[PDB]
Design a protein around this motif. Structure first.
Motif, PDB file in Angstrom:
ATOM      1  N   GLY A  95      -0.803 -10.121  -4.294  1.00 32.43           N
ATOM      2  CA  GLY A  95      -0.896  -9.206  -5.414  1.00 32.43           C
ATOM      3  C   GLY A  95      -1.884  -8.154  -4.923  1.00 32.43           C
ATOM      4  N   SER A  96      -1.505  -6.881  -4.920  1.00 34.80           N
ATOM      5  CA  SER A  96      -2.427  -5.855  -4.442  1.00 34.80           C
ATOM      6  C   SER A  96      -2.423  -4.594  -5.295  1.00 34.80           C
ATOM      7  CB  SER A  96      -2.115  -5.494  -2.977  1.00 34.80           C
ATOM      8  OG  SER A  96      -0.843  -4.881  -2.842  1.00 34.80           O
ATOM      9  N   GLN A  97      -3.517  -3.848  -5.216  1.00 41.90           N
ATOM     10  CA  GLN A  97      -3.687  -2.587  -5.944  1.00 41.90           C
ATOM     11  C   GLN A  97      -4.279  -1.593  -4.960  1.00 41.90           C
ATOM     12  OE1 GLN A  97      -5.838  -5.288  -8.926  1.00 41.90           O
ATOM     13  NE2 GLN A  97      -5.826  -3.296  -9.952  1.00 41.90           N
ATOM     14  N   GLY A  98      -3.917  -0.322  -5.100  1.00 42.33           N
ATOM     15  CA  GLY A  98      -4.443   0.687  -4.196  1.00 42.33           C
ATOM     16  C   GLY A  98      -4.077   0.427  -2.745  1.00 42.33           C
ATOM     17  N   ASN A  99      -4.735   1.133  -1.830  1.00 45.53           N
ATOM     18  CA  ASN A  99      -4.470   0.978  -0.404  1.00 45.53           C
ATOM     19  C   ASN A  99      -5.582   1.625   0.434  1.00 45.53           C
ATOM     20  OD1 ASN A  99      -2.127   2.339   1.997  1.00 45.53           O
ATOM     21  ND2 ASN A  99      -3.213   0.364   2.011  1.00 45.53           N
ATOM     22  N   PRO A 100      -6.670   0.892   0.696  1.00 44.67           N
ATOM     23  CA  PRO A 100      -6.925  -0.481   0.265  1.00 44.67           C
ATOM     24  C   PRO A 100      -7.423  -0.547  -1.174  1.00 44.67           C
ATOM     25  CG  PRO A 100      -8.829   0.274   1.374  1.00 44.67           C
ATOM     26  CD  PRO A 100      -7.804   1.404   1.484  1.00 44.67           C
ATOM     27  N   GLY A 101      -7.372  -1.744  -1.737  1.00 47.77           N
ATOM     28  CA  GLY A 101      -7.813  -1.970  -3.098  1.00 47.77           C
ATOM     29  C   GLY A 101      -7.935  -3.472  -3.281  1.00 47.77           C
ATOM     30  N   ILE A 102      -8.061  -3.910  -4.529  1.00 45.22           N
ATOM     31  CA  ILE A 102      -8.198  -5.340  -4.817  1.00 45.22           C
ATOM     32  C   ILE A 102      -6.955  -6.114  -4.371  1.00 45.22           C
ATOM     33  CG2 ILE A 102      -8.514  -7.066  -6.603  1.00 45.22           C
ATOM     34  CD1 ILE A 102      -9.880  -4.874  -8.281  1.00 45.22           C
ATOM     35  N   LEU A 156      -0.297 -23.983  -6.572  1.00 47.22           N
ATOM     36  CA  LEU A 156      -0.975 -24.942  -5.708  1.00 47.22           C
ATOM     37  C   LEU A 156      -2.313 -24.414  -5.166  1.00 47.22           C
ATOM     38  CD1 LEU A 156       2.259 -26.236  -4.007  1.00 47.22           C
ATOM     39  CD2 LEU A 156       1.024 -27.185  -5.961  1.00 47.22           C
ATOM     40  N   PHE A 157      -2.420 -23.097  -4.970  1.00 43.42           N
ATOM     41  CA  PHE A 157      -3.686 -22.478  -4.570  1.00 43.42           C
ATOM     42  C   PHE A 157      -3.672 -21.002  -4.943  1.00 43.42           C
ATOM     43  CE2 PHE A 157      -1.149 -22.460  -0.559  1.00 43.42           C
ATOM     44  CZ  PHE A 157      -1.151 -21.096  -0.234  1.00 43.42           C
ATOM     45  N   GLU A 158      -4.853 -20.456  -5.202  1.00 38.58           N
ATOM     46  CA  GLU A 158      -4.998 -19.055  -5.571  1.00 38.58           C
ATOM     47  C   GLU A 158      -6.262 -18.534  -4.922  1.00 38.58           C
ATOM     48  OE1 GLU A 158      -4.823 -20.097  -9.871  1.00 38.58           O
ATOM     49  OE2 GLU A 158      -3.631 -18.261 -10.062  1.00 38.58           O
ATOM     50  N   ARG A 159      -6.189 -17.340  -4.359  1.00 41.18           N
ATOM     51  CA  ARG A 159      -7.343 -16.709  -3.734  1.00 41.18           C
ATOM     52  C   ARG A 159      -8.030 -15.794  -4.744  1.00 41.18           C
ATOM     53  NH1 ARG A 159     -11.595 -15.841   0.036  1.00 41.18           N
ATOM     54  NH2 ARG A 159     -12.590 -14.318  -1.352  1.00 41.18           N
ATOM     55  N   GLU A 160      -9.348 -15.938  -4.871  1.00 40.31           N
ATOM     56  CA  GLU A 160     -10.148 -15.098  -5.752  1.00 40.31           C
ATOM     57  C   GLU A 160     -10.001 -13.645  -5.265  1.00 40.31           C
ATOM     58  OE1 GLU A 160     -14.544 -15.906  -6.978  1.00 40.31           O
ATOM     59  OE2 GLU A 160     -14.604 -14.605  -5.207  1.00 40.31           O
ATOM     60  N   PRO A 161      -9.828 -12.698  -6.197  1.00 40.49           N
ATOM     61  CA  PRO A 161      -9.671 -11.294  -5.812  1.00 40.49           C
ATOM     62  C   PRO A 161     -10.704 -10.788  -4.812  1.00 40.49           C
ATOM     63  CG  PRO A 161      -9.095 -11.524  -8.086  1.00 40.49           C
ATOM     64  CD  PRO A 161      -9.624 -12.879  -7.651  1.00 40.49           C
ATOM     65  N   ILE A 162     -10.207 -10.169  -3.748  1.00 42.50           N
ATOM     66  CA  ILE A 162     -11.041  -9.578  -2.693  1.00 42.50           C
ATOM     67  C   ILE A 162     -11.100  -8.093  -3.078  1.00 42.50           C
ATOM     68  CG2 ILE A 162     -11.194  -9.078  -0.224  1.00 42.50           C
ATOM     69  CD1 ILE A 162      -9.274 -11.623   0.074  1.00 42.50           C
ATOM     70  N   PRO A 163     -12.306  -7.544  -3.303  1.00 40.67           N
ATOM     71  CA  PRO A 163     -12.418  -6.139  -3.696  1.00 40.67           C
ATOM     72  C   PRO A 163     -11.660  -5.099  -2.878  1.00 40.67           C
ATOM     73  CG  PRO A 163     -14.465  -7.208  -4.084  1.00 40.67           C
ATOM     74  CD  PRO A 163     -13.628  -8.197  -3.298  1.00 40.67           C
ATOM     75  N   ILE A 164     -11.714  -5.203  -1.553  1.00 34.07           N
ATOM     76  CA  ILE A 164     -11.037  -4.219  -0.706  1.00 34.07           C
ATOM     77  C   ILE A 164     -10.204  -4.867   0.394  1.00 34.07           C
ATOM     78  CG2 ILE A 164     -11.402  -2.349   0.985  1.00 34.07           C
ATOM     79  CD1 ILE A 164     -11.950  -1.411  -1.800  1.00 34.07           C
ATOM     80  N   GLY A 165      -8.893  -4.638   0.356  1.00 35.95           N
ATOM     81  CA  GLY A 165      -8.005  -5.176   1.372  1.00 35.95           C
ATOM     82  C   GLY A 165      -6.647  -4.505   1.268  1.00 35.95           C
ATOM     83  N   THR A 166      -5.722  -4.874   2.146  1.00 36.07           N
ATOM     84  CA  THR A 166      -4.381  -4.319   2.105  1.00 36.07           C
ATOM     85  C   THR A 166      -3.378  -5.415   1.790  1.00 36.07           C
ATOM     86  OG1 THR A 166      -3.699  -4.696   4.417  1.00 36.07           O
ATOM     87  CG2 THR A 166      -5.031  -2.702   3.942  1.00 36.07           C
ATOM     88  N   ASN A 167      -2.219  -4.989   1.322  1.00 34.95           N
ATOM     89  CA  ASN A 167      -1.157  -5.919   0.993  1.00 34.95           C
ATOM     90  C   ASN A 167      -0.762  -6.775   2.211  1.00 34.95           C
ATOM     91  OD1 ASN A 167       2.013  -6.382   0.694  1.00 34.95           O
ATOM     92  ND2 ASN A 167       1.121  -6.214  -1.356  1.00 34.95           N
ATOM     93  N   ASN A 168      -0.563  -6.138   3.362  1.00 31.30           N
ATOM     94  CA  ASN A 168      -0.189  -6.900   4.551  1.00 31.30           C
ATOM     95  C   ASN A 168      -1.269  -7.915   4.942  1.00 31.30           C
ATOM     96  OD1 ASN A 168       2.348  -5.685   5.018  1.00 31.30           O
ATOM     97  ND2 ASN A 168       1.459  -4.112   6.347  1.00 31.30           N
TER      98      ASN A 168
END
Length: 132
Positions: free
Chosen positions: A12-19, A33-45
């Motif tokens: 799940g991503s926003q912006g580029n980079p974004g959350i 089964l698992f979920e990653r806590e939102p990372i403030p700045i990253g890319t979809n890939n």
């Protein structure tokens, strides 16, 4: 054909980079089964790469032979090559996502796994189960 007894991952991503965040779910039931806590700045890939590697680690720890589905040809390629080819600049704001990606690459370079990594065919099977 679809292997229902499998793990589906997606980003799940926003912006580029974004959350950026990602999760893994049971393909048949949709159970998370698992979920990653939102990372403030990253890319979809980068998120998709992390999601697959997290899935590999999850299945290996549980001694599972279930395959993983991803709808990202790019991320699947990166994982098989054991190298994420992101062009995201490396600065203080992007340090966390890069650290996680670099460590995921290191895990791939130092472990073996039996998990088939399969392409989810969105055009024919509907959205991947882990879609946001």
């Amino acid at each position: 054909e679809i292997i229902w007894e499998s793990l589906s991952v997606d980003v799940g991503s926003q912006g580029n980079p974004g959350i950026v965040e990602y999760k893994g779910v049971d393909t048949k039931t949709g159970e998370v089964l698992f979920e990653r806590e939102p990372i403030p700045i990253g890319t979809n890939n980068m998120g998709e790469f992390l999601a697959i590697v997290h899935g590999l680690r999850y299945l290996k720890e549980r001694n599972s032979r279930k395959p993983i589905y991803s709808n990202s040809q790019t991320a699947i390629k990166w994982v098989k090559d054991k190298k994420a080819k992101s062009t995201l600049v490396r600065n203080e704001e992007t340090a966390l996502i890069w650290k996680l990606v670099d460590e995921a690459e290191e895990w791939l370079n130092t472990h073996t796994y039996e998990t088939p990594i399969l392409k989810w065919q969105t055009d024919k099977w509907g959205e991947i189960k882990a879609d946001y």
